[PDB]
Structure 1
Amino acid sequence: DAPPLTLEGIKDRVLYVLKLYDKIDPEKLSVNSHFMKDLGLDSLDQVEIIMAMEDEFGFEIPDIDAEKLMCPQEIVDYIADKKDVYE
């Protein structure tokens, strides 16, 4: 029992649950858009978003990674490192 993933679908689901969140906009919601650069939201709220990622996908990401995600592209890249779905 193991349905394999896809790159586009996991990007869509990450951007989906980001768009569910409050203090950002659905207007300019880019995968290639950082957090401290243009959005200005908190590092505290950044790790809240990290926790939302983990509670969707059911595994920890460690602390030395947790400093250095900062954007949804590297989020999708690191969960693609974990689950390793590269057809």
Structure 2
Amino acid sequence: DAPPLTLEGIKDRVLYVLKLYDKIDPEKLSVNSHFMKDLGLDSLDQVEIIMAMEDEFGFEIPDIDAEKLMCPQEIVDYIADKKDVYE
């Protein structure tokens, strides 16, 4: 029970499940994008996104962090911290 994770792979999987989400566009979907400034979605659907990451990868993230991710790059960084992603 050890499939190897990598940074490009986790970036692709997180961007896949963000692009599959409804009320964003596949055009203006950047890695360095805000969940507050440019995507314009609210905190509620932001924590729906946080729930999507928790339900995909298989672990909770605490609410001391769920205040303050707000961008996909720090999402990738935080699952990189939970998983310690090197071979």
Residue ranges of structure 2 left out of the alignment (5+ in a row) = none
Equivalent pairs: percent with the same residue? 100
1:7-64 Cα offsets, whole Å, 9 max, x none, are 0010000000000000000001111001111111010000000000000001000001
TM-score by length of 1: 0.97
Rounded Cα–Cα distance in structure 2 between residues aligned with 1:73 and 1:33: 8
Structure 1: which 5+ runs fail to align? none
Query: How far apart are residue 86 of structure 1 and its match?
Result: 2.3
Instruction: Return structure 1 stretches of 4+ with deviation > 3 angstroms.
Output: none
Q: Equivalents in 1 of 2:86, 2:68: separation in Å?
A: 23
Number of aligned residue pairs? 87
